[PDB]
Amino acid sequence: TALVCDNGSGLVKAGFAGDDAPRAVFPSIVGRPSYVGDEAQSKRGILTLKYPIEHGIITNWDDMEKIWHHTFYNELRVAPEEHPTLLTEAPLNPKANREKMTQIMFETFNVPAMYVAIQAVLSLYASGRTTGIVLDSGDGVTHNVPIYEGYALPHAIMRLDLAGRDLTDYLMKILTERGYSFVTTAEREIVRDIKEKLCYVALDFENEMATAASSSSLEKSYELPDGQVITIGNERFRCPETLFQPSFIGMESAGIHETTYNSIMKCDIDIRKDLYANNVMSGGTTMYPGIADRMQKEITALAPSTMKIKIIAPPERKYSVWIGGSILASLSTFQQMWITKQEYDEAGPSIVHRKCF
Amino acid sequence: YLMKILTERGYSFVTTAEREIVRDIKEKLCYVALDFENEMATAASSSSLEKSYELPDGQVITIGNERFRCPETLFQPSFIGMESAGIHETTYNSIMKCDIDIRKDLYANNVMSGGTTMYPGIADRMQKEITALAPSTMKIKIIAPPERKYSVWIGGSILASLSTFQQMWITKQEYDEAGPSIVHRKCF
Amino acid sequence: TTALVCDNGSGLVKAGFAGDDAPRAVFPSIVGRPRSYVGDEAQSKRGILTLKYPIEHGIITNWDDMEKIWHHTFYNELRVAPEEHPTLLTEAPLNPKANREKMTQIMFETFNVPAMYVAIQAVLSLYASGRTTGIVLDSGDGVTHNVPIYEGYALPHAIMRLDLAGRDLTDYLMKILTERGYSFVTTAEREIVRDIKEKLCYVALDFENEMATAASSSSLEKSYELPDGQVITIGNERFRCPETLFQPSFIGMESAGIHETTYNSIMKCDIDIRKDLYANNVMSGGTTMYPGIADRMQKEITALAPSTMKIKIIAPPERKYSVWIGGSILASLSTFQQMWITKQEYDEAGPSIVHRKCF
Amino acid sequence: ALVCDNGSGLVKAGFAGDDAPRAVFPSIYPIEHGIITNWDDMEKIWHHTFYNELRVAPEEHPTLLTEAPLNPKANREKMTQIMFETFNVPAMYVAIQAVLSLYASGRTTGIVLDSGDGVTHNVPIYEGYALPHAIMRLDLAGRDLTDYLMKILTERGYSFVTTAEREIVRDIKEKLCYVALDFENEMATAASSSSLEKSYELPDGQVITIGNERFRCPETLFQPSFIGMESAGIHETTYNSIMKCDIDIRKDLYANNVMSGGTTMYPGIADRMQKEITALAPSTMKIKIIAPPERKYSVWIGGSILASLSTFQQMWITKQEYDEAGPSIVHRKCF
Amino acid sequence: TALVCDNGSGLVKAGFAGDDAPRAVFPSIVGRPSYVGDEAQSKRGILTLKYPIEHGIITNWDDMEKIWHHTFYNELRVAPEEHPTLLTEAPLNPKANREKMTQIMFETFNVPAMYVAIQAVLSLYASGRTTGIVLDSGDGVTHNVPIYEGYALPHAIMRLDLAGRDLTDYLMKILTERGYSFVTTAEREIVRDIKEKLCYVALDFENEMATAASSSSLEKSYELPDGQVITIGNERFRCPETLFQPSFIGMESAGIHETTYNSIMKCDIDIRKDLYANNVMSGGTTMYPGIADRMQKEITALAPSTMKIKIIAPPERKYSVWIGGSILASLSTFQQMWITKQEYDEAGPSIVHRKCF
C-alpha cells in the first residue's frame, strides 16, 4: 500500500492510497526548546516554533525532515521502507528543491519508491479530469494552474500571496473594529473557527452590504469557549470578499477571478474553451459558501459572451488535492511511474525531473 | 410594540427573557421625539441617533429609530392598530368635558405620573401638542418631576402622614357599624 | 397547556410533564396477560400471568402491548387526558420509517392528542446538557448506541449499535457470582443480583491493575446481605461486571468495546467536526451509572485519539434519566411550540407528516 | 530516612540527620541539565546508591529525592513509580533542589541561584513555594567552565586534550579560579604584574603558571558571550527572575539571595553578585547575598534537615497511598 | 506614552499607561533636615518625617510638588513635558483642591496634557464596569462610592476615617496587651508586616474568638529580626474586625457593611439592584483573606431576602485603582478627554471641572 503526503503551508495531509480521506491532518510546524504539529503547538509556550513551508515552498530542510519523520512513525504508524510514497509539491517549485525532496526521501528514509506531483494537478485528477484550470487556495498561498493533458502550463501559472491565514488575520482586524477583541494566538484560533463556520461569499457585494446596513437579518452569533456570546455581521462576507478585492488588505493584486481570467488568456487560444468549461476549485480557502456562484458570475463577466463556463467545487474540495494523490497512486498504470530506489542510485536527484511531470 | 419593531429589524425577541430584555431596552434607551417626522429624517440621514445595547449573553445590538417610534404610539395609537385618540387629544377632550370656568386651572396644571411617563422629552412634546390644541392665549404648564414614577405612592405617603388626616381613617369600629358601605361616605 | 414527555425504554418507561426536573413515573415496560396488567403491577402478578416485552433493543415490535403501555402511562401513572396535552415521544437511533409513522398514527387516532413530536433519544440526551453538537453514548436496558450529532442532526452513517446493555450485565454478574459458588439461577435471584449490580459495581480505571489489587488484598471486598439474611462477600465481580462494556468478549461477543465503538463512530464522521465530537462525549442511560466509567472512557479515548486532542467526557449524576430531561427541556421551550405536529396537520398529511416535521 | 540529590555531574547520597553526605559519586550521562533522561541507567545509579555506596535496604527507609526546577509532571511521576515499584520503599518524597537549598539556610522565602555541573537556575520561592512563572534557566555551568578553561589554558601554551587531562583542568579550576570584583581592573592588574599568577603542580611533577585565566574562567557566568552564548549573565537573570515576581514580595527576594551548587564556590562571587544586583536594583533596595561554606552540598543538607523534622512525617507518600492513586499521587502530596 | 499616578495617603503608585502593574510604589512621606519616600524612611533617623496626604486629601502643596518631582525624575525617570498625565483624587475632593492640582500640573511641570479621575471610579473601571458600588479602603481613609454610568453619586458617598494605618495601630495595642512591646516606628513597621502577613477577617467573630480560646489552631508564629519568636492568636482576626466594629478603637461610626448598606439606601431605588450586584472592593486594606465572604454575609443580612448580592474582589485589588487609570489613559477614545495645554492656557484651573466629571 502506497502513502500519500500533501505538504501544505499550514496543514500536512497524510494517509494511505485508496482511502477516501487522509488518515492524519496536522499543522506543519516544528518546535525546538523536537516537536511536530499540534503537540508542538500545545507546548508552544515553552519552546519557539518554526514554519518550514511558507507560501507553498520548502525552505527549512531539517524541519521538513522532522515533519516527515513524525508523519511516518507517529501519525501513520508505518515503516517508510515498506511503502512507496507520493509527495505533493507547489506549482513552480524550483528544480533544486524537488531534487532535495527526492534525495531526502530516498537516502534518509530509504523508501523503495516515491513520486512528486503538482498539487493542482492532483486536484484535477481527483475529479477524473486531466485537462482544466485549477484554483488551489490554501493557508499560505493561492494559485491558478491551467493544465492540458496532465501537463501544468508553467508560463500561464498565477501566484497570489493571499490565502486563508491572511483572511483570518483580516477577520481578526474587522471583528476588533466591531469591538470584540481578538489579538492573541488563542483568540486567533477562535477567529479561524468563526471564519470557517460563519463566513460566506456574497453574490453581489454592494447589495449584501446594503442589506447588512438595512437590517440585523444577516447577523449571527458565535459562542466563545467561556460561553460568552459575540455577534458577527457583514464581517461574515467582507472577510472572503478580500479574495475578489485584495485591496481590502492593502494588496495591489488582481482578484482570484481576474487571475483565473489572466491565466486562461495566457494559454493558447485552442485549449482556452477547454479551460473555461473546467474550473476546479481546491484548498481550504475555497470552502466559503457562495464562492462557486460568485466565481461563475465574475468569470462570466470577464469571458466571451458565448463561452461555456463551469465551476467545479465538490464538498470534499478542501482535501481534493490529497484525494487526487490517493487516486493516482492506486492506479495500476501508475506502478511504472514510480521512481525506484535502484533507479535513484543510478540517476541521483536528477531522476525526479524526468520521471515526474 | 418595541419587540415587534426590533423583530422587523431582524433581531429575534420571541422568548419571555427576550421580552424582559426588550423592556429594559425601552426603559434605558427610548425617548419621545419633539417632532416625529424630523426625527425620522435625522434617523435616516445619519447614525447620530443610533445607540448600542449589550445583551446579558454579551451579544451587542444597535437600535435606531425604535428609540422614539416605540413611545410615539402614545401620541399615535394607530401604530398598534388602535382607533383611539392620542394622550394629548384625550387630555384635551378631558379638559373640554369639564366646566369652562375650571379649564384655565386645568391647563396650567398637567401632572404626569406613572412609569410610562418616564420617557425623556414626553413633557415637552405634550406641551407642544396641548399648546397646538388649546386656545392661542391659554397658559399651558406640564408638570413632570423626576420622581413621578412613584409619585402616586409618594402622594399617599404624604397624605397618610398628615396630622389633619387622622380623623379621615375608616376605623374598624366604623366598619363594624356600617359595613362595606362606609367607604363611599368616608373616602372621596 | 402542559406538554407530556414519554421516553419508551426497552426496560423502563420514563414519563412525566414538560418543565419538570425529573420524570413523574418510571416503570418497567412489561405487559401481562393471564396464562391485563402493565409494569410494576404486571411484575407483581408475574407468577400468575405470562409477560410480553413490547420494546426490544429500543424498537417497538408489539403494537397492541405498546398501546396498553401508553394507556397505562396516561391514565394510571400520570393521571391525564391525552387529548388535553401535546406529547413528546422518544425513539431509538435508526428507527425505521414505518415504525415512527405508526407511532404518529396511534398517537393521533387512538389517543386523540392535540399535538405530538418524535425525538431521537441521543439527541435529547445531548440537548439536556445544553448542547447541540457532540457524540452520545446511550446505554440502557436492552441496547447501547453511539450517536454523533452535529447541530441537532444525528449522522446516520456514523451511528454504532451494540446489543450489550444493562440486562446482559446483570446476566453476566449472575454467571460470575455463580462461578464463585453462590447460586443465582432463579428470576427472584436475578432481581437480587441486579440490585447488587446497581449498588456495588463500578468501572475500573485500569482493569489489570484492579485485578491485581483484588488478588493482593481484601481491600476491594464488600458485603451484601441477602433477603434470607445470608451474607455474601463480593470482590472483583464488582468491576468485572461492567468491564464487559469495554470487553464484550467476556460474554462471547466479537464486538469492540464502547470506547472503540465511540472512536469508530467519531472516525465515520467528517474530519472537520471530529474535534467538536471529541470535546463533547455525553453519556446517558442507566448502564452508564457505574462510578469510574467517565474516567475510564477518558483514558481510553485519549489513548486512541491523537495525543493532543482535547477530550471531555460529560457524565452528570442525573444521566440515568438525562434523555427524558432533554425532552422535558425541549418540549418546554417557547420556540418549540411551532415544531409540534398538530392534529389538523396530521389530518391533512397522515402518518407521512412526521418525517418532514421531525428531524 | 535517606536523602538523595540526583545531580547532572554528581550524585550526593546519605542518611537523614547527618551533616554531610556519606557517599558522593559521578553520575555515570543519564541526567542532563538536571532532568532524568535515561531511566535504565538512572535505575542503575539508584541501585548503586542503595546497595554499594550506602549499604542499606531500600524497603527499610523513607527516601527523599531531589528534582530540578520545572521538572515535568511525567518525569516526577516516573521517579515515584520506580521508587515504589522497583525499590519498595515504605515512604518517599520529591523536593525541589533550590527549595532545599533555601531551607538549609533556615529560610522559606528568598531567591536561590543554584549552579551545578550541567545547569544553572534562578528560583524565587515564597513560603516554600517555587514561583514557576519566574524561574530562569541557563544552560551554562561547571562543565562548560571546565571546557572554557581548557581553551584558555591552550592559549597559555599548555595542552589539555584527554579526559584525564580534563579532570586535571577541573581540579585546576576548583583550586585556582576566582571571580574578579571588577573584571577590567583585574585584567589590567594581570597585565601589569605577576601578582595574580599561581602555580599548579601536575602529577608528572610539571609545574604550570596561570594568570588572568583564574578569573576569566568564572567570568563566563557573568559574560556568557565568552563561550558564544547570547544569553544574559547570572546577575541579569537573577534580576529578571525577581522582576517577574509580584512587587510586594520583591523586597523579600532581594534581601535573600541564596547561592547553592558547586559552581557558586568561586571566591569573590558573592561580592560581585552583590555589586551587580545593587547596580541593577532600585537605589534604596536592601540587598543581601547568602553563600554559606557548605553550599556545595547545601541542597542535600536541606533534604537532610527536612527529612529529620517531626512535622515532615505526615508529608511522606506511603506505599499504600501510591497503591491507591498511582503515579498521580506525587503531585498532590509533594509541594 | 501616558503616565498614571495614584496619590495614596500612604503609598504613591506610579507608572506607564498600558502596563498591568505600577512601576514604582513608595510611601508618601517628605523628609526635611529634602528626602521623599523610601530615601526619607532610610534617613528617618536623622530627620523628622511629614505626611503631605492625610485621609486621601492633599494638604501640603510644597511637599506634594516634591513628591511629584521625585515621582517623575527619580522613580519613573521621565520628562513631564513629554507625557500626558492621569492623576487620581479622593471622592468628594474639594473644587479648589483639584483646581490647584491642575494648575500645578500645567504651570510647574509643564505637562502637555492631564486628567483627574476619582479613585473609586478607576477601581470600578479596572473591572470593566461603569455602574456599581466601590469600597475603597486604603492607608488613610475608607470610602463607599456608588457610581452610575461613570458618575459618582455625591449624596450617597460615605467617608470613614478608619483605614489600614489605624488597623496597624490597633494591632500594636493588642499585641502590647498580650505582652510584646511595640512602641517605636521601626517596631511599627514590623507590626504592619505582621498585619499584612498573618491577619484575616473571621466569618463569625464570636465562634472564632471561642475557637482561639479553645485551642491553638489559630495561633501563628512570627520571627522578629532579633531572632526572637512571638506567637499571635486572636489578634489575627481581632485587628481587621475593627472595620466591622469601629468601636474597637473608640469610634462611634458604623462598620463598613453598614456604611455600604446605608450608601446603597441613599441611592434611588431603581438603580439599587444594580448596586447590590456590583460591589467592587479596592485598596490595600481590603486584602485581608475572608473579607469578601464576611461582606457577602453581612450585606445579605441587611438586604431584602430576594436581592442578588455579588462581591467583586480580585486578587490584584490592592493596586486596582492604578490599573483602572492605566486602562483608561490607554484607550483611544480617551485621547480627546485630556485637558490640553492650550485649553488650560485659555480657561485656567476652571477647565478641570468641565472636562473631568
Added chain:
Amino acid sequence: DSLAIKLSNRPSKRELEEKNILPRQTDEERLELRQQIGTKLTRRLSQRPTAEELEQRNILKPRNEQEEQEEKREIKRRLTRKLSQRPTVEELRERKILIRFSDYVEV
C-alpha cells in the same frame, strides 16, 4: 454484628453525590441552571443550519455507499484511460500549448 458489616460498606459523600442521591446544588441553583440551558438551547436551535447546508460542508453525504463506489470506479477508469493517452512534450510544443522550451525540457 450486621451493623458493623453495613458500616464497612459505606460509600463516600462524593460517591453518593455521584449516584444523584445527594444534591450538589440548591433548588434555586438548579432552576437558574435550567433557565440558562434553556436559553442556550433556544439560541442554538435558532441558528440551526439546514440539511443541504450540512451536505455542502461534507458533514453528511446524500449518496449511498454503493453510489459512491460507482463514482470512485468511473473516475479511476476515466483517469487511467486519459493518462495512457497522454501526449508528448513535443506534440504540445508543436501546437503552441507549451510556449517555452525550458518547460519540461528534461522529459
Added chain:
Amino acid sequence: CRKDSLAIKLSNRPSKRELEEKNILPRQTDEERLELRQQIGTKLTRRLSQRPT
C-alpha cells in the same frame, strides 16, 4: 535550634490557594491577562461612548 526556627516556619506555610488570593501565584497566563485587559478596554470604550450626561 536553627531547625526549630525552620520547623516553626514550615508549620506556618499557607496553602497554594492562599498565595493565589494574595496575588503571589497568578491564576492565568500573561496571554490570558492580555485577553482580559483587551476585553475590559473595549467594553469600557463602548460604555464610555454611550455614557449619558
